[PDB]
C-alpha cells in the first residue's frame, strides 16, 4: 500500500539543514518548494544544494519547485508609521507616490484608476481593510473612496481590487532574475504567482525557450477571480496548477471558494495535469504536534476532490514540527485514499474524456488493472507522458514509471500515484517490456503469481502517444507440456509415483505430481486441484480424468516427479499447458 | 429553487426574543435547539413560548429539539483554585471524593478503575491535559498515572477515557426531569447526548412510552468511540443521528474523524433517518459577519457527505451575528446543492437498498421525477414515512409533504428537501390525490403544464408502506375531441376560419384553430405545430394532413374558434385528443 | 465489407471438376467437405487433388473437411424386397441376422435389447416407420414391439432408438481407414458423425496422436439426444461442432429442435470453438436457381444464432445449381450480418466469459475496435489461437490473421470473420507488429488515416495466451515539429507565405501552411482547421493564435511550405506535433 497524493514542502529555517531535509524526505516529502518572495539567491542556492545532498544521503527523488514572487499592486509608506481610517473617512488613492495619510495614500499601479469602476471595492492589507470607490476624478487621477472594514494600515500592505482585471504584462524584473537563477540551478518546477491569463504563462515559456530550459514545468497559481475566469486557457497553456485557497479568499467571498477549489481541481484532473492544493492546510501545526479536526478534514477533502498533491508552507518553513507536518500529511493521505471509489472515478474520466488513442489505451489499462486486480501498472517512459496520463484515471494499483533521465523522474514526483525508477534508455519494444518487468520485480510490489499491466507508446525510444498495452504474469515458468482442458489451479505440490504414496500424501486441494495415474489413484485424484504427469498423451488416464472432473491437467512434463517437491506452491495451467512458481489466480 | 438541507439553531440570550426569533425563522431556521446543559425549566419554558409566538408572527413551521445534558464522568474540586501537573508528575486518581492536588484528584465514576487498563489514556479539561495509566492499585482503588500533555486544571473539568467503554445505565435524574418537562411542553425532538449503545436509546423510548409521548423523535448523538463502534445498533434503535465533530475529536484522533463523519452520515442516509452535522460549523461568526473559507468549506462538505441538516451553536446562542449565521448557512446550502449529482445518488441508494415495496416505489418515483424533470414530488402523509423515504433518494425536485397534523409537519422540519403543508385528514385515494394536487398548486412551485409525482401508501388514512405512485399534469383541460396521431405540441393559438386569415395570421410554430382545413390552407398548415378543428372526422383534411406532416391534430372541438383566442398558450395532445392550458412538454 | 460467416460445401459429381471448384471458390466456398459415407479413397483422392489445383488456379485458402461415416445401428434384408407393417402388426426384432418379414426382422446391434426399455420407441428408415417396445423377451433375445407410423420398409434402412443411450466404443474399422487416409492426404478437418460422448472424440484424438497428426481439428457432430445431453463434455473435448438439424429431427421431436440448435450454437460460441449449421439449408436449390423464403429465413436465423459457418450438402454435391447455392449462401450472409448488434454481443460474451488474461485482452481489443471504429483487427498468429479468440467477440471490424503456415490458414478458414494471410515466421515483438501493419496495408482494407488494433501473445514466436494489444494509425509521417495544444484536425493544405496569398487561397476548413503568421493573416486564420509554420517557437504568433482559437498548430516544420502542396489531404496533430498523410479522425 502506497500513498498516492504527493507532498510538497516549503523550505526554510526550520527545514534547511541537510539532516532536517533528510528527515522531511524520509517522512514522505516529494517536492521541495523554495518561496522566492523572501531570501536571496545565495540562500536558495544553499537550500537547493542541501536538497540534493539529502536526496543522496537517502535514495529519494525530490523535485525542486520555485515559487516566484510575481506581480502585485502594493501601497507606499503611511507617514512614519501607520494610518487609521474608520467606518467612513475620506480615503483618496493617488496614482502617484504620496505620503500616505488618513486622507490620501498611493499605490504602485497608476493604471488602477484606468480599470476600477464606480462603487467598486478596493482591499488593503491582504483584505483586512476594504474600500468603496465613490468618485473617480479621472482628471487629477485620484480614485475617491470611503473606508469600509477599517483598521490599522501600516507601510507597504497588499492592494487587492476584486472585480476588475489588472493588466501587468511581462514578468517582473525580479521574477526574471529568479527564473534564470532557477535555470542555472537546474530546478524542476516553477510556480508562477498570480496567473490571470494564458499570456502570463506564455511569457515564462518564452523565456524558458530562450534559455533552452523548456524541460522545466510551469505550474499556474490561481489567486484571484480573473485567474479563475481564465482557468480554461490557463490550464491549456501551463503544465500544472496551484490552487491557493488563502489568496482566493482575499478577492473572492469565502462562501464561494469551496466550489471554486473543487472546480479548479476537476478541470486539471480532466486535462491530466498535476494540481496542487495550497495554503491553510495544517497551519496550526506550526505550534502543535497534531492538527485540528478541521485541518484534517480540509486536507482529506482536497484529496477526495482529486488534488495530485498537497502543499505545506510555514508548517515546514518555520514551524516547530516540520517533520511531523509531513508525517501527518502522509498519514492523512493513506487513510483518505482507502476511501477512494476507483471504479467510479475511472467511469467519470472515461466520460468527459476526448476520443484519442492514448485515452483508449489508458482506459483499457485502467479497466483491466481493476478487473484483474493487478499488483501494478508499469510505464517505461521517455518524458513521462504515459505515466501522467494513466495517473489521470486514478488507478488503485501503483504506477511504476521507469525513466532513463533523473530529471524526468522529478517531473513525476509531483504526479498522483506515480513512483519513478531509472534504467538505461531502451529503443525496442521487447527491451521496454523487459525493463518494465524488471522494474516491477525490484519495486518490491509484486510476488510470483501477481499481474502487472505494462503500457507505453511505441516507437518507445521517443516520447509520444500511448498505444500499447500488455498484461504480464510475474511468476517463472517451471516447466511445460501438453495442457488438458482450459482451466488453471494452484495449490501445494504432492509428489506421488505410486498409489500408496498417492493415498498417504494426497491432501485436499493438492497438486498431484506423478508419472501417470490409473484407476487405483482415483481417491487421491478426487482431492486434487490439478494433476501433473511425466508420461501420457492427450488421451491418457490423467487427461481423461481431468476432463471429467473438470480440473486442470498437464501431461508430458519431463522430470516432473523430481523437479517438483512436496509442499511447493505452483500453478497448473491446463490451457497452454504450463506450470508456474507460486499462486497465480489469473492467467 | 429551494434549500434542501435544514438549519438547526441553538437558542440563547442572543436569539431568545420573539423579534429575534422572528428573524431567525425568516432567515431559514427550521429547528430550534434548546441546550439543557444550561438554564432552568422556566427559561426554556419562555424560549419555547417565544418560538411558538414567533412561529405564528410568521407562517413558519419550526420544530423544537431538546438537547439533553446526559451522563459524563467529571472531576471534583482542585484545592481552592487549580492544580498544575507537568510533563511528568505523579497524578493518582481516587475513586472517592478527595481534594484534588498535584498528586491525587478524584472523579465521579468509581467504576473507572474497574474498566480502565494499564497504559491507557485519560483526558481532563475536555482533552486538554491527558494522562497515562501506569499502575492500577485495584486494592486501595487508585488508578496511578503520569501526566502527559500537562497544563492548568481548574475545578470540575471534563473526564474523557478513550479506549474503554463506560457503562452508565439509566438516564440521569436530571435528564429525566428535562425529558418529562419536554413532554409537558410538547417538544418535537430529543437529542440524547453521549449515546454509546442501543440501550441508552431504549431507555428514553421506554420513558416516552410510559408518559404516552412516543411521537417525540429520538436523535442519538455520537460523541465517542463506543458510540461510533455501536452506530449500527444505535441507528437501528433511534430515529435520527447527531454527529458532534467537536466531541469526537476529544476521544478520537483528529486525523480519523473526517472519515468517521462521512461514515456516520452515509449510515444514516442508508437507513433514511435524519442526520445532523454539529459543532465547529461557523464558530468564527460569533465575532464576525462572515465566515472563514475553511468554515464555508467544512459546511459545504458536510452537505456533499449527505447530512440532512446543519447545526448552529454559539453562533446563534450568544454570538454577535445570529441572523447572519443562519443566512450564510442558508446561502452556503443553496450554492453547494446546485453541485449535487442527483442521478448518481439515486443510483447509489438504489443499490445498498433493501428490496421492499416502499423502496421500489421510492426508486420509481425518484427515477421518474428525474427523467421527466418534474416540478415536484408531493406526498400526502399520515406520520411522515413516505416523505422521509423519498427524501432518502435525494431528489432534485422539491418534496411537498401534506400532513393533517402540525406536529407531523415539525417532525419533517428536520428532513432534507421536505417542505410541509397541512390539510384535512383524508381517507380515500382520490381525496389524497386531490389534496396532493391542491398542495402543489398552492405551493407556488408549479405552473400550468408542469408535472408532479404524487406518491403515498394506501389505505392512505393510515400510516404504513409507500405503494402507490401517480404522475399528474397540472394544467386545466380546456377542451377535447378526437385526437389524431400520437404526438403533442404547444405553441400560441392562431384562430383562422378562412384561408385568408390563415395566411395573414399564421406564424411559425403556431397552433392553428379553425372550423376545418382544405388545400388552400396548406402554406399556413406547413408552419403549424398543431391543428385544432371544430369540424371533421378521423379522415377529414386536417387529420390526413396531420398524419402526413407528423404534427398533432385534434378534431371535433366544439367551439374551438371562439373559446381559443389569438396568442393563447395551449398544448395539443394528438393521442388521447385533448387541449391543455399552458405549455406541457411531456404528456 | 466482408462476409463473416464461412461457407462449407459438400463436394460431388456436380462440383468435383477443377473448373467447377474454381467457381465454387470464387463464389465464396471456404471449406470443402468430403462425405466419406459414399465413394472410395481413389475418388476422394482425386477431389482432394482438384481442390488443391483449383485452390492454386485462384489465390484462395480452402480447408478440407472429412465427414466420416461413423457408427449406426441398421436393419438387415427384408426378404427379397420390402416388408409392410400397418398401424399394428406383430413386429419382433431379433438380435441376430434373420430374414426380415412382417413379423420378425433383425438389427446390427445385438446390444439393443440390453439397453431398450419397455414402451420405448424404435424408428426405422430414417424415422419414417416407428415402433413401440411392448415386451422384451430377454431370454430368446427378441424385443417385441407393435408397429406405429407404418409404411414400406426396404433393405438396410436406418435404425434409430430415441430415449436410450447406445454404446459403440472405438471407431469403425471403416472410419479408421478413412482417418488414416485423410492423414496421408493431409486434410485439415474431421467431422465425426454421431458423437454421443466425450470418449468418441478422444478415440479420434488418440488415433491422430498415434500417427503424429494432432494438427487436424476434430469437429463433433451432434445428431441425437445423448450427443445433446453430453454437449458440455463433448465441446470440452472436441475442437468444434456441427449441428445437423436433419439428424436431430429423427430422434428428437421437431418442436424441440429449434431451441436445441440455438443452445448448441451458444455453447460453442461461449467456448470460442467453431460451430457449423448443417442440413436442410437450401435444399430446394438442387432443382432451383433461387431458394425459398423459408430457406433464406432459416439460414439467416442460424447466423443470428451465432453459427461460424453454414454447410451445403446436396446443393453442391449433386444439385443443378452448385455455384448458385454458394452465391446465395454468400449473399444471405452479407445481408443478415448488417443486422448484427455488435456492441450487444460483445457485452454478452464479456459476461459469461471466464476471467483470463486472453479474455481481458480480447475484450479490450473488441471494445476499442468498436469505440474507435477501426478498419481492422490484425492478429499475427502461430497456431491461430488469438484470431479464434477475437472472433468469439464477434467484431464488426474484419480480423486479419497473419500465419506463417498454410495449414494454420486453412484451420482459420472455418472461423467467423477471419481472413488469413501468410508471412515469414517472426520472433520479436517489433517484427510481429511490423508484419501486422504490412498485412493490413496489403489487405486492401485500410486507407491512410485508418486505425487497426493489433493483438497477439508474446513471446510471439510461440503459440499461447493473448496478452498484448496496440492501436496503430496507418498513415505515413510527413513531418514533425513542436505541436501546440492538444487537438488534431485534417482538411486540405493551403500553402501561403504572404498575407495576400493567405486571403486569396484560404478556404473554410483548410490547413494553413506558412513560414509564420501575423496580425494581417487573421481573416484566413479564422477559417483554418489547423496551422503549420516553418518558423516560430512555442510563443510565436501561430501558436498563441492556435491556443486562443482552439485549433491545432504545429510549429518548426522545416520545409513545410515546399513539402506540402495546395490541396493535399493531411492531418495536423497538435499534441505530439506531427503531420500525417490523409485524414485521420482519431489519433
Domain harbouring C125, CATH code: 2.40.33.10
Show residues of chain A in contact with B254, CB under 8 Å: 290-293, 295-296
Give the CATH number of the domain where residue B511 resides. 3.50.30.10
DSSP-derived secondary structure for B13-79: TTT-SHHHHHHHHHHTEEEEEEETTSS-HHHHHHHHHHHHHHHHHTT---EEEEE------BB---T
Subunits close to C (at least 3 CB pairs below 8 A): A
Please indicate if any CB of chain C lies within 8 Å of the CB of A473: yes
Residues of B in contact with A295 (CB under 8 A): 254
- Provide the angle, in degrees to the nearest 10, between the axes of the packed helices A293-305 and A322-337: 50
Among candidate residues B373, B378, B369, the one with its CA nearest the CA of residue B438? B378
Among this protein's residues, is B33 annotated catalytic?
yes
- Establish whether B221 is a catalytic residue: yes
Which grid cell is C419? 481472413
Q: Note whether C377 contacts A: Cβ–Cβ < 8 A.
A: no
B104 and B238 in a single domain? The answer is: no
The A residues from 185 to 244 touching C (CB cutoff 8 Å) are 198, 202-203, 205-206, 209, 214, 233, 236-237
Which residues 334-373 in chain A show a CB within 8 A of chain C? 354-357, 360-361, 364, 367-368, 371-372
**Residues B160 and B189 placed together within one structural domain of the fold:** no
For chain B, report the end-to-end CA distance as a whole number of angstroms.
23
Q: Which of C236, C240, C390, C221 is nearest to A484 (CA)?
A: C236
Q: Which residues touch C294 (CB under 8 Å, ≥6 apart)?
A: none
Q: How far apart are CA C360 and CA C283, in angstroms?
A: 42
Same domain for A423 and A496, yes or no, is no
Is B547 exposed, middle or buried (CB count within 10 Å of its CB: 0-12, 13-18, 19+)? middle
Query: Would you call B335 and A249 a contact, using CB atoms and an 8 Å cutoff?
Result: no
Q: Do both B233 and B326 map to the same domain?
A: yes
Using CA atoms, how far residue B175 sits from A368, B172, B200, B317, in Å, is: 58, 5, 12, 21
Cell of A22: 533528510
Query: Could you give the angle at which helices C173-185 and C41-57 cross, rounded to 10 degrees?
Result: 30
The torsion angles phi and psi of B398, rounded to 5 degrees, stand at -65, 150
Judgement on whether residues A346 and A447 belong to the same structural domain of the protein? yes
Q: What resolution, expressed in A, was reported for this entry?
A: 2.4
Residue A548 with chain C: CB contacts under 8 Å: 198, 233
Measure the CA angle with vertex C219, ends C213 and C221; round to 5°.
Answer: 140
Q: Which of A340, A359, A392 is the last residue of a domain?
A: A340
CB atoms A537 and C209 under 8 Å: yes
Q: Is B491 left (phi over 0), alpha (psi -120 to 50) or beta?
A: left
**Distance separating alpha carbons of residues B431 and A110, to the nearest angstrom:** 72
C304 sits in which H/E element: helix C293-305
Which residue in C197, C220, C351, C471 has the most chain A C-beta atoms within 10 A of its own C-beta, making it the best mutation to test that interface? C471
Contact A300 B259 (CB under 8 A): yes
* Of A246, A255, A290, Cβ closest to residue B291: A255
**Is there a single domain that holds both residue A365 and residue A430?**
yes
Question: Shortest CA distance to B109 belongs to which of B92, B90, B93?
Answer: B93
Contact C587 A198 (CB under 8 A): no
Q: Which residues, in sequence order, are CB contacts of A347 under 8 Å at separation 6+?
A: none
Judgement on whether residues C435 and C526 belong to the same structural domain of the protein: no
Strand partners, B75: B107
The answer to whether residues A298 and A181 belong to one domain is yes
Residue positions of A annotated with a catalytic role: 33, 74, 221, 279
Domain boundary among B103, B133, B168: B168
Q: Give the residue numbers spanning the domain of A553.
A: 476-587
Contact C22, C62 (CB under 8 A): no
Domain stop point among A121, A145, A168:
A168
Regarding whether A536 and A443 lie in a shared domain, the answer is: no
Do both B154 and B180 map to the same domain? no
Contact A300 B248 (CB under 8 A): no
One domain for residues A59 and A76: no
CB A80 within 8 A of CB A127: no
Which of B57, B69, B74, B503 is the catalytic position?
B74
Cβ within 8 Å, pair B258-A296: yes
Strand-pair category, A399-403 with A468-473:
unpaired
Residue in the block written with cell 431528489 = B395
* A167: Cβ contacts below 8 Å, ≥ 6 apart: A111, A115
The span from the first CA to the last CA of chain A, in angstroms, equals: 23
Cβ contacts from A onto B, under 8 A: 87
Same domain flag for A354 and A458: yes
The CATH number covering residue B204 comes to 3.20.20.60
Please state, in angstroms and as integers, the Cα–Cα distance from residue C403 to each residue in C6, C71, C125, C365, following that order. 18, 36, 46, 19
Any A CB within 8 A of B491 CB: no
The Cα–Cα gap between B490 and C525 comes to 44
Per CB-CB distance under 8 Å, the chain B contacts of A247 are none
At what angle are helices A385-392 and A357-371 packed, to 10 degrees? 60
Longest CA–CA separation in chain A, Å: 112
Helices C257-271, C293-305: axis angle to 10 degrees equals 40
Contact A83, A153 (CB under 8 A): yes
> Do the Cβ atoms of A302 and A261 come closer than 8 Å?
yes
C-alpha separations of B182 from B42, B469, B552, C90, C243 in Å: 12, 38, 62, 99, 80
Closest C-alpha among B345, B333, B347 to residue B301: B333
Omega cis (within 30) before A73: no
List chain B residues with CB under 8 Å of A254: 290-293, 295-296
> B249: how many CB neighbours lie within 10 A of its CB?
22
Give bridge partners of residue B509 from the DSSP assignment. Answer: none
A with C: how many residue pairs have Cβ under 8 Å apart? 128
Taking contacts as CB-CB distances below 8 angstroms, the residues of chain B near A297 are 245, 257-258, 261, 298, 301
- The annotation status of C157 as a binding-site residue, yes or no, is yes
Q: Is residue C35 marked as binding? A: yes
Instruction: Report C:275-334 residues touching A (Cβ under 8 A).
Output: none
Q: How many domains is chain C partitioned into structurally?
A: 4
Give contacts of B280 with chain A, Cβ < 8 Å: 293-294
Q: Is the dihedral of CA A270, A273, A274, A275 positive or negative?
A: negative
Give the Cα separation of B433 and B456 in Å (integer). Answer: 9
3-state secondary structure of A493: strand
C423-429 contacts: CB < 8 A, separation 24 or more?
C423/C380, C425/C382, C425/C461, C426/C380, C426/C460, C426/C461, C427/C459, C427/C460, C427/C461, C428/A428, C428/A429, C428/A430, C428/C460, C429/A428, C429/A429, C429/A430, C429/A433, C429/C458, C429/C460, C429/C468
CA distance C250 to C73: 14
Q: Report the binding-site residues of A.
A: 33, 35-38, 67-68, 74, 157, 221, 223, 246-247, 279
Q: How far, in Å, CA of B289 to CA of C502, rounded?
A: 60
Q: Which three cell numbers stand for residue C499?
A: 498575407
Binding residues of B: 33, 35-38, 67-68, 74, 157, 221, 223, 246-247, 279
Amino acid at each position: 500500500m502506497k500513498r498516492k497524493t504527493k507532498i510538497v514542502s516549503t523550505i526554510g529555517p526550520a527545514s534547511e539543514s541537510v539532516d532536517k531535509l533528510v528527515q522531511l524526505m524520509e517522512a514522505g516529502m516529494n517536492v521541495a518548494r523554495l518561496n522566492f518572495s523572501h531570501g536571496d539567491h545565495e540562500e536558495h542556492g544553499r537550500r537547493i544544494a542541501n536538497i540534493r545532498e539529502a536526496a543522496k544521503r537517502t535514495g529519494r527523488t525530490v523535485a525542486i519547485l520555485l515559487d516566484t514572487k510575481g506581480p502585485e499592486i502594493r501601497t507606499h509608506n503611511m507617514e512614519n508609521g501607520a494610518i487609521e481610517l474608520k467606518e467612513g473617512s475620506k480615503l483618496v488613492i493617488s496614482m502617484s507616490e504620496v505620503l500616505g495619510t488618513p486622507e490620501k495614500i498611493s499605490v504602485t499601479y497608476p493604471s488602477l484608476i484606468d480599470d476600477v469602476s464606480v462603487g467598486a471595492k478596493i482591499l488593503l492589507d491582504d483584505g483586512l481593510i476594504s474600500l468603496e470607490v465613490n468618485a473617480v476624478d479621472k482628471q487629477a487621477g485620484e480614485i475617491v473612496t470611503t473606508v469600509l472594514n477599517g483598521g490599522v494600515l501600516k507601510n507597504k500592505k497588499g492592494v487587492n481590487v476584486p472585480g476588475v482585471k489588472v493588466n501587468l504584462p511581462g514578468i517582473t524584473e525580479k521574477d526574471r532574475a529568479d527564473i534564470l537563477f532557477g535555470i542555472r540551478q537546474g530546478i524542476d518546477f516553477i510556480a508562477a504567482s498570480f496567473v490571470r491569463r494564458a499570456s502570463d504563462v506564455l511569457e515564462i515559456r518564452e523565456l524558458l525557450e530562450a534559455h533552452d530550459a523548456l524541460h522545466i514545468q510551469i505550474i499556474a497559481k490561481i489567486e484571484n477571480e480573473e485567474g479563475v475566469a481564465n482557468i480554461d486557457e490557463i490550464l491549456e497553456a501551463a503544465d500544472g496548477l496551484m490552487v491557493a485557497r488563502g489568496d482566493l479568499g482575499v478577492e473572492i467571498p469565502a462562501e464561494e471558494v469551496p466550489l471554486i477549489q473543487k472546480l479548479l481541481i476537476k478541470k486539471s484532473n480532466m486535462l491530466g495535469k498535476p494540481v496542487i492544493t495550497a495554503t491553510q492546510m495544517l497551519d496550526s501545526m506550526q505550534r502543535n504536534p497534531r492538527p485540528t479536526r478541521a485541518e484534517a478534514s480540509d486536507v482529506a477533502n482536497a484529496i477526495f476532490d482529486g488534488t495530485d498533491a498537497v502543499m505545506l508552507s510555514g508548517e515546514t518553513a518555520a514551524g516547530q514540527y516540520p517533520v511531523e507536518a509531513v508525517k501527518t500529511m502522509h498519514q492523512i493521505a493513506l487513510r483518505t485514499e482507502q476511501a477512494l471509489e476507483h471504479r467510479d472515478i475511472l467511469s467519470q474520466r472515461t466520460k468527459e474524456s476526448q476520443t484519442t488513442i492514448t485515452d483508449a489505451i489508458g482506459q483499457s489499462v485502467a479497466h483491466t488493472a481493476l478487473n484483474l486486480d493487478v499488483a501494478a501498472i508499469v510505464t517505461p517512459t521517455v518524458s513521462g507522458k504515459t505515466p501522467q496520463m494513466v495517473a489521470k484515471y486514478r488507478p488503485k494499483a501503483p504506477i511504476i514509471a521507469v525513466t532513463s533521465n533523473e530529471a524526468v523522474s522529478r517531473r513525476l514526483a509531483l504526479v498522483w500515484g506515480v513512483y519513478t525508477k531509472e534504467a538505461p534508455h531502451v529503443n525496442t519494444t521487447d527491451e521496454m517490456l523487459d525493463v518494465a518487468v524488471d522494474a516491477a520485480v525490484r519495486s518490491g510490489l509484486v510476488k510470483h503469481g501477481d499481474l502487472v499491466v505494462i503500457t507505453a507508446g511505441v516507437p518507445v525510444g521517443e516520447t509520444g502517444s500511448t498505444n500499447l498495452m500488455k498484461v504480464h504474469v510475474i511468476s517463472d515458468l517451471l516447466a511445460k507440456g501438453q495442457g488438458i482442458g482450459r482451466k488453471s489451479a494452484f495449490g501445494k505440490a504432492v509428489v506421488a509415483k505410486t498409489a500408496e504414496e498417492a493415498r498417504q500424501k494426497m491432501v485436499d486441494g493438492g497438486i498431484l505430481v506423478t508419472v501417470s495415474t490409473d484407476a487405483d489413484m482415483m481417491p487421491a485424484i478426487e482431492k486434487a486441484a490439478a494433476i501433473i504427469t511425466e508420461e501420457g498423451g492427450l488421451t491418457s488416464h490423467a487427461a481423461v480424468v481431468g476432463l471429467s472432473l473438470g480440473i486442470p491437467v498437464i501431461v508430458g512434463v519431463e522430470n516432473a516427479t523430481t523437479l517438483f517437491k512436496d509442499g511447493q506452491e505452483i500453478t497448473v495451467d491446463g490451457g497452454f499447458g504450463a506450470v508456474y512458481r507460486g499462486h497465480a489466480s489469473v492467467l
